[PDB]
Design a protein around this nucleic acid. Structure first.
Lengths: 219, 111, 133
RNA sequence: AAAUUGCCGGGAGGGAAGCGGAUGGGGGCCGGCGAUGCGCCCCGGCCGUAUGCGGAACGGCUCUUGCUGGUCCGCCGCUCGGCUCGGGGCGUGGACUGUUGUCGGCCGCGCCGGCGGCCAAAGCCCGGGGGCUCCGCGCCCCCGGCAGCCGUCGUCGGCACGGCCGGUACCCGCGCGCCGAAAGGCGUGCCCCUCGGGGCACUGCGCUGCAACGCCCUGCGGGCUCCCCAUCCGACCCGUCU
RNA sequence: AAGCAGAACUGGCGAUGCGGGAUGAACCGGAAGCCGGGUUACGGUGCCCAACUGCGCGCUAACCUAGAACCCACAAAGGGU
RNA sequence: CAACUAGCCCCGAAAAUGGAUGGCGCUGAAGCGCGCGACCCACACCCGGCCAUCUGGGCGAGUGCCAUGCCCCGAUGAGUAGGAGGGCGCGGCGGCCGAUGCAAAACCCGGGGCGCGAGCCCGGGCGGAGCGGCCGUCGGUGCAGAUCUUGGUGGUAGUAGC
RNA sequence: GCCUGCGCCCGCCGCCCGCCCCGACCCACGUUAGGGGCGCUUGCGCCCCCAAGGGCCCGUGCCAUUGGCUAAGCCGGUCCG
C-alpha cells in the first residue's frame, strides 16, 4: 500500500517522464509510430498468435523485483545464512552477493566445510543475527553468466561433431571454477577466524530437537 | 558427502498425521489434518503454513533402482486450537498412514 | 489457450465410470448405465457411495471433447481418399487405420500418411497387422 | 457364446466376521514415450528468373467489338542468382511426463501502529471540604490543577507468510532515447508544501507466459484389474405394490 | 386414550438425499450440476469421532434406579433436621 | 426457634432373552445449570475453473464449406408420476462409398484409447466367405425379472437313500 | 524329551536381504504432599533448601582413507562371577 501509493494516486508518473524525455528531442514517435514497422506477407495460416516484442519487457523487470525485499526479510552482503533447503542444507554459510537470476552466491571455505561456490534460493534461508565482514573479498569474478551448467547438446567441444556418451546431464564441474574458488575462500577464512569458534560452528549443523519449536527459535 | 554436514540425521521437527478433514459422518481426503509434535497452540502452528511435507515410506519393489519412495506436499493453513494443521499433498497420502509420523520441514523459511 | 485446457481434462478426470446398481451380484444385469426408474432405488434418491449418476456437469471442456490425449482429434480412416481431408488439418487431426482394412491396404495408408506428417497411431496399427507384439 | 467344471498361475492368508462396491495406496499385468528441433555458413547436388522467343487453359470485363492485366510450360538466346537432401564447419537449443522457482488474481492466516468517539475519565502528585468509622487508623464521596492509559464503539494506516487458480493470447499489463549487473532513476510548467517532498497537466503504433531439473532410446513415470490394509452412505439386491 | 378416527391453517414426506438428532421416510439445518480452495449451519470439541482434558462461577456424593440434549423412547400426587 | 420459596440429590419408582446418556467411562466431570473466547463442521454459502440449459448479444459480402455453424454473456440446474427435446444400437430396403481367402463376418481377450452416457474404436488370439460405414426409408427393433416360456448348468450331494 | 539319502543345529565372521508403524541421543527412593544434605538433641527431631528437569551423544567426510597419542577413560563386542 505504502510503496504503491505514488503510482496509485498518480497513474503512470514514471511512464509520463519517459514520453516527455523523448519529446524533448522535438517531434518524434507520434509521427514515427504510424510509419514504424513490418507486416503484410504471411506464413502458414492466419498467424493469430504470440510473443516476442512488447510482452517480454515488463515481465523481465517484474521477475527481478522479488530478489531483494519480498523474499529477503533484510540481509546485507556478508550476513551468515542458514540454508534450510538445497543440497547443502544445514550448513551455515556466508553470503557473497545476490545474482541477476535472484539466486544467491555463497561459499563456505572449501577445505573446512564442503560447500562450493554454488547457487541457492533466497526463499529457503533464515537470516541470522551474525555478520562476517566481507570488506576485502573479491566476489566480482563470480557472476550470473559464470553459472551456466553445460547441457547435453553433444560433446562439450566446439560443435557439429559426432560425439560419445560420457556427458554429465544434471551436473558438471568446470575445472576453472575449482581453481577460482580457492582464491576467494582465502580472504573469507581471515574474517571467520577473527571471531572465535565460528569456523567449527558452520560445519556442525543446526536441526530442531524433539520439543523444540521453530517459531520460538527464530534467529 | 556433498549436502552432508556434521551430525543430525533427523533434519526436521516431528509431526503426526492423525486423520483427514472430517465430520463425524464423513471424511474429505483432499485435505489432511496433522497434529504437529511440540506444537501446543493456534499461534505456534501459524508458523507452519507454506512449509514442505514429506511422507517417506519404503516398499518391496524398486523404482528407479530404489525401494524408498516419497509423496510430497505443503502445509496450507492452521486448524483448531491444539496445533493441528491443514495440509494438501500432490497426490493424497495413503489413509493407512493414520497414526504415522510424517516430516514437516523448515525447507522454505518465511523467517 | 489450447494447452491449459488439455491439462484440465486429462489430469482432473471425471472417469467416474457409471455402473448400473447390483451389476456386481447379477451377472446378466448389464454394466451399461440405465437410469433407476423406481422411486425405491437409493441411486435415484442420490445417496452418495451408491455410485453417482451421469449428468452433463461431469462433462469436459468443449474444445477437449472427442480428442485423443495427444490433443489430436481422432479420425478413423477407411481409405486413401479420406487422407486428403486430414492433410488440411495436419496437427489438429489424427489418422487411425480402420478394422475392416486388411494388411496390404494398411501399408499404402501409412506411406501417404507419412507425407502429411500425421504419423501417430496409423503406423502402430499397421505394424501389429504385419506380425509384431 | 454365456453357466458350470477342471488344471495352473497371481494376489491374500490359515488371529479372525461377511452386501461382495465406492474412495485412497502398494504389489500383479500391460501399452505408451516428434520421425529427434531451429538459425547460419562451407563443400557436394539440382534448378533457374528478368527480358527476347515459341505454344497455350485465365482474368476484369466488355459481351459486333474493344482495351488493360496472365501465368505457365516447352525450352533456345542474353545477364545474373536461388533452393533442397546429405556431409562438413559455428551459434541457439526444440521430444510425452513428473518436479521446483516467479508475476498477477482470489481467499485465509498471525502480528504491529494511529486518530476520533463515549462532557472523556480511571489514574498520581498537589490542594480543599464533607460524611462514615466515633476506638482510631481506615473506608467512602465530591470538587479544582496533572505524567498518565483504559474497555468498548467507529475508521484509517503498516508488516510477515501461505493455499488455490491462471499467466493474463485485442485497450489487464506494457515497451519503443539514456545510463544503471541490477532494481531503479533521469522533462517541463503549474500549484500546495513553500523544509523534506507531494499532487496536477501534457504522443501515437505494436503485442501477450518468464527461470530451472530428470529423461523420452538405456530405462522408466504411467493406465487398468484383482487383493490386502485404510476409509464410508452401507436403511438386504433390484423391481413392483404401497 | 391411541403411532386413533375426523376437520382448520401451513410446511414436509410422498417427489429428499446430504449434514444433525447414536440409530430413525416425515423432526432439526438446508432443497442437491461438476470440481479445487476458502467459509459456515444444524450439532459438537475426554476418547470413540473431525474438534479446547480451554477459561470462568455455582450446584451434585445418589445400597435400593446418580446424572447426561427438542420431537424421543415415559412418569406423578406426596414426602426429607 | 417456626412457617415458607425453589435447586440438585434421596424416596415414592416393581416385569419378564442380558443392556443400554449409542459406548467406554466420567465426581474442582467428560455430570447438571450458566457465561466467555477459541475451534471443529453439509452436495449449504463465497471466489475461480469447467459442463449443458435458458436468456441477451455478436460474427457471412463471396470465393472453406456444419451459419440448424462458430464466438462473447450472465443467471440457472434435486427430481417420482408424466410431458416434450436431442441422440445411440440392431435388422432389412433405395442411394452412396469402403473392405476381403496375401484371411470376411462371427466369437474370445485381470490388452490399449475415446464419449457424461447410449455406445464406439483399435490391437492380439480363435476363425474360414462374405460384410460394414455414411445419407434417406421402414420394423416382428434393444430386456433382469413376468409364481415368465423353451434349452443348458450349479449348490443341494456324492448327501437322503438303495 | 527327541530330531542326517551329508540333512539339521549351535558356536565363530563374511556378505546380503526384510521390517519398525516409522527405529535413527538417553533417564527408578519410596510417598499423594514430601525429598535431600548437614551439624547433631540421633529423631515420626533441628537447621537449610527445592516445586516449571537432568546428563550425554552433541565433532567421528549417517559417521571416509591414513599416522600417532592423553588422563587411562568413554562406548560396543568378548570373557570372570
Amino acid at each position: 500500500m505504502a510503496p504503491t501509493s505514488k503510482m496509485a494516486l498518480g497513474i503512470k508518473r514514471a511512464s509520463r517522464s519517459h514520453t516527455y524525455h523523448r519529446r524533448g528531442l522535438w517531434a518524434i514517435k507520434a509521427k514515427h509510430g504510424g510509419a514504424l514497422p513490418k507486416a503484410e506477407k504471411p506464413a502458414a495460416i492466419a498467424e493469430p498468435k504470440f510473443y516476442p516484442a512488447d510482452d517480454v519487457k515488463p515481465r523481465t523487470v517484474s521477475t527481478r523485483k522479488p530478489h531483494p525485499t519480498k523474499l529477503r526479510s533484510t540481509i546485507t552482503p556478508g550476513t551468515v545464512l542458514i540454508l534450510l533447503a538445497g543440497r547443502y542444507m544445514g550448513k551455515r554459510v556466508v553470503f557473497l552477493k545476490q545474482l541477476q537470476s535472484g539466486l544467491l552466491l555463497i561459499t563456505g571455505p572449501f577445505k573446512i566445510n564442503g560447500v562450493p561456490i554454488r547457487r541457492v534460493n533466497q526463499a529457503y534461508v533464515i537470516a541470522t543475527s551474525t555478520k562476517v565482514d566481507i570488506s576485502k573479498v573479491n566476489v566480482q569474478k563470480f557472476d550470473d553468466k559464470y553459472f551456466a551448467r553445460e547441457k547435453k547438446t553433444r560433446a562439450k567441444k566446439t560443435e557439429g561433431e559426432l560425439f560419445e556418451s560420457d556427458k554429465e546431464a544434471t551436473k558438471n564441474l568446470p575445472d576453472f571454477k575449482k581453481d577460482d574458488q580457492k582464491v576467494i575462500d582465502a580472504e573469507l577464512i581471515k574474517a571467520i577466524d577473527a571471531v572465535p569458534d565460528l569456523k567449527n560452528y558452520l560445519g556442525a549443523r543446526f536441526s530442531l530437537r524433539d520439543g523444540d519449536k521453530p517459531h520460538e527459535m527464530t534467529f | 558427502m556433498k549436502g552432508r554436514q556434521g551430525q543430525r540425521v533427523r533434519l526436521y521437527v516431528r509431526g503426526t498425521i492423525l486423520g483427514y478433514k472430517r465430520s463425524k459422518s464423513n471424511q474429505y481426503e483432499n485435505t489432511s489434518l496433522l497434529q504437529i509434535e511440540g506444537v501446543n497452540t493456534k499461534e505456534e502452528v501459524g508458523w507452519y503454513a507454506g512449509k514442505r511435507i514429506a511422507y517417506v515410506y519404503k516398499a518391496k519393489t524398486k523404482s528407479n533402482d530404489s525401494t524408498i519412495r516419497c509423496i510430497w506436499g505443503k502445509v496450507t493453513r492452521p486448524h483448531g486450537n491444539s496445533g493441528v494443521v491443514r495440509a494438501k499433498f500432490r497426490s493424497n497420502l495413503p489413509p493407512t498412514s493414520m497414526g504415522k509420523k510424517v516430516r514437516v520441514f523448515m525447507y522454505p523459511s518465511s523467517i | 489457450m489450447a494447452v491449459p485446457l488439455l491439462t484440465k481434462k486429462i489430469v482432473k478426470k471425471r472417469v467416474k465410470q457409471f455402473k448400473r446398481p447390483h451389476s456386481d451380484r447379477y451377472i446378466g444385469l448389464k454394466t451399461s448405465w440405465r437410469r433407476p426408474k423406481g422411486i425405491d432405488s437409493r441411486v435415484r434418491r442420490k445417496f452418495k457411495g451408491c455410485t453417482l449418476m451421469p449428468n452433463i456437469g461431469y462433462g469436459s471442456d468443449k474444445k477437449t471433447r472427442h480428442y485423443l490425449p495427444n490433443k489430436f482429434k481422432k479420425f478413423v480412416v477407411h481409405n486413401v481418399s479420406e487422407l486428403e481431408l486430414l492433410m488440411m488439418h495436419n496437427r489438429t487431426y489424427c489418422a487411425e487405420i480402420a478394422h475392416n482394412v486388411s494388411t496390404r491396404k494398411r501399408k499404402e495408408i501409412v506411406e501417404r500418411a507419412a507425407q502429411l506428417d500425421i504419423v501417430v497411431t496409423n503406423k502402430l496399427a499397421r505394424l501389429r497387422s504385419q506380425e509384431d507384439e
